[PDB]
Amino acid sequence: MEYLIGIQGPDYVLVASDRVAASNIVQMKDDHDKMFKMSEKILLLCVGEAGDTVQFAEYIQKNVQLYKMRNGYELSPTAAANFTRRNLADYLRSRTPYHVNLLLAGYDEHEGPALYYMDYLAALAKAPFAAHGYGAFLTLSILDRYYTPTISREKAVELLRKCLEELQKRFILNLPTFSVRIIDRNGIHDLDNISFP
């Protein structure tokens, strides 16, 4: 089971994802990129069924690019999440159900940072932090203790590493390498890829 995590800072949104893509008893691709770029300040995190993860997320990727090119400006973080939910809800009763778990990370020039939680049933709820997979049980509890709206990204990245190191202790699956990026007024900023020699 793939893992996702995100954190909403006062001016920022800190997200992280596992880079491992495995099949059967082996890990085929450990550097796999789960992060999809919806817009300049808007990212996306999609995990789920191996077939529905890549296919359904690429539909959202271009559908957001449809809006930005037609009107000359991208969707807002709130507008993006609500349009992705109806896309997932329309195929719920179809003959091809999509099993996916999405986190929408984006920054707005007015409302500021926004983080959105979405399940496979297309239920959208705004939360300061959210996570997917079975590893969400071992992590979010740490966020309950250490989270404050005034936290600085310098301590948040350190606390994010403390949560992800728990995946190497209790959580069974290896997941050696994690990808971490941040969103703020200056755009997408890559962070040091978590590596365990």
Binding site: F137, L140, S141, R145
Partner: protein, 201 residues
């Protein structure tokens, strides 16, 4: 159901929620999940409530028959092995019981786990129940064997309170029991919500 225990320099601390629910309706909020076996020996409960109440008293029966026989004050290791063997004969008949045994002996404040299928483990930090995975996160963060008496209460307090917040089957009042060489002692009993108001501020 959220139950957790960990051992360190000053001995074991057992923390548990009070809430046990059936379906969507909460049966009782005030349920005391911690089982009292011996003055210095302390058990827990997980999974089915009746399976724990039945078998943990048989363990308390065996521990008392032992102390009445040889007077040697049975070690935590012998108590954990006898509890596991009793679950092996009925394996496959539908008995579901989790539990954790805590106590101090000549070796030290041992911490063991007994599963429904007979799995017997040993380690520094254990947790069980539906919220066990929510407990592992807060407990592991900021934990060392050198933690003091007062610092460990803050770890055990925040362990249940933040874990029961994310679980629909976990709640009630926090019951935390420290373990010493003479015996375990009741530390505090406090509502989870009352502590939630102090953490938000």
């Amino acid at each position: 159901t959220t139950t957790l225990a960990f051992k360190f320099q000053h001995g074991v601390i057992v923390a548990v929620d009070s809430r046990a629910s059936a379906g969507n309706y909460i049966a009782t909020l005030k349920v005391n999940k911690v089982i009292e076996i011996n003055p210095y020996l302390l058990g827990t409960m997980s999974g089915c409530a009746a399976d724990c109440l039945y078998w943990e008293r048989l363990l308390a029966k065996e521990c008392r028959l032992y102390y009445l026989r040889n007077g040697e004050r049975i070690s935590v290791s012998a108590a954990s092995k006898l509890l596991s063997n009793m679950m092996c004969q009925y394996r496959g008949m539908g008995l579901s019981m989790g539990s954790m045994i805590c106590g101090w002996d000549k070796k030290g404040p041992g911490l063991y786990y007994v599963d429904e299928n007979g799995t017997r483990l040993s380690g520094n930090m254990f947790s069980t129940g539906s919220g066990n995975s929510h407990a592992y996160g807060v407990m592991d963060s900021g934990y060392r064997p050198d933690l003091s008496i007062e610092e460990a209460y803050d770890l055990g307090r925040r362990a249940i309170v933040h874990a029961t917040h994310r679980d629909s089957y976990s709640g009630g009042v926090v019951n935390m029991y420290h373990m010493k060489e003479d015996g375990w002692v009741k530390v505090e009993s406090t509502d989870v919500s009352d502590l939630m108001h102090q953490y938000r501020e």
